């Protein structure tokens, strides 16, 4: 029913497909952002224009000194099981990477995804925020070390242990998939590395049954993520439904964060992505 459905999308140069991606521009954007905009929070977004929802984004632990330690440019998403299954970022900055391991670690977070690279086209994504090596290093309160690095064709796997500097003993471990072939222009080649990589992501996720919201990231947290996102519920409704929301899915992520799935390119590249799941069970 899909492959008919996505074919009427197509037709006529996929005018259809293009109206409903533009029904959803104002989805949740008369939301305030108010703390987002603080002054003394101004450093801490990396883009002027992509900010949390006063009424989504994630808290830090308020520090007794600054009123506004509790900021982070961070949002809560849901997905097809809890409300808040996802926390979605922005790539991190220097000034904030202990802002994010605080999360990481106050959030109950086993799992990171990060589909950027650092640098593309000579232009800084994102600042190298775990270690280099396999010695420890602290971030903020908490002590962070790499235990292995996977290096493989379309992502890299990471491990690292975290722990609190009070209770070594109460250390935990962590997870980062690092999608590592995003094209500097455009969607992915194929749809099977995104379907493969997302895959391979929900598979970790279903063996933390305890852990709290998979943080996903890219630069901005909105274009790539939301694809990944968008992709990861799809597919698992998908497996278990048969059926398929992928206007519905969209939706959802734009009343808690603006711009999650960010170009109409993105929007086809999702139902692309279904497609083909099923084109190679028929």
């Known amino acids: 029913q899909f492959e008919g459905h996505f074919m009427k999308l197509q037709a006529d140069s996929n005018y259809l497909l293009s109206k409903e991606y533009e029904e959803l521009k104002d989805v949740g954007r008369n939301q305030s952002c108010d703390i987002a905009l603080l002054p003394e929070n101004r450093g801490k977004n990396r883009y002027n224009n992509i900010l949390p929802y006063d009424a989504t984004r994630v808290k830090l632990s308020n520090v007794d000194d600054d009123p506004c330690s509790d900021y982070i440019n961070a949002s809560y998403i849901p997905g097809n099981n809890f409300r808040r299954e996802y926390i979605v ?24 995804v990060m589909v950027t690279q650092c640098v593309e086209k000579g232009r800084v994504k994102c600042d190298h925020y775990w270690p280099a090596d396999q010695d420890s290093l602290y971030y903020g309160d908490l002590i962070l070390q790499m235990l292995s690095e996977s290096v ?5 796997i990471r491990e690292f242990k975290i722990c609190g500097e009070e209770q070594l003993d109460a250390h935990r471990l962590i997870r980062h998939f690092h999608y590592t072939v995003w094209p500097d222009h455009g969607v992915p080649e194929t749809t099977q590395s995104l379907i493969q990589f997302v895959r391979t992501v929900r598979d970790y996720i279903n063996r933390s049954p305890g852990a709290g919201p998979t943080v996903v990231h890219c630069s901005a947290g909105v274009g ?22 992928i206007y519905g899915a969209v939706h959802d992520l734009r009343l808690h964060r603006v711009h999650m799935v960010q170009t109409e390119c993105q929007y086809v590249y999702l139902h692309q992505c279904v497609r083909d799941v099923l084109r190679a069970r028929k």
């Not at 493989?152 to 890299?156: A, G, I, K, R």
């Not at 993520?225 to 929301?245: E, M, W």
Request: no cysteine.
């Open 89 to 112: 970022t922005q790539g991190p900055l220097p000034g904030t990477k202990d802002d994010f391991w605080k999360m990481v670690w106050e959030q109950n977070v086993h799992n990171i």
């Open 152 to 156: 493989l064709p379309e992502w890299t």
């Open 224 to 245: 790539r993520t939301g694809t990944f996102i968008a992709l990861d519920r799809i597919l698992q409704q998908l497996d278990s439904k048969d059926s398929v929301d």
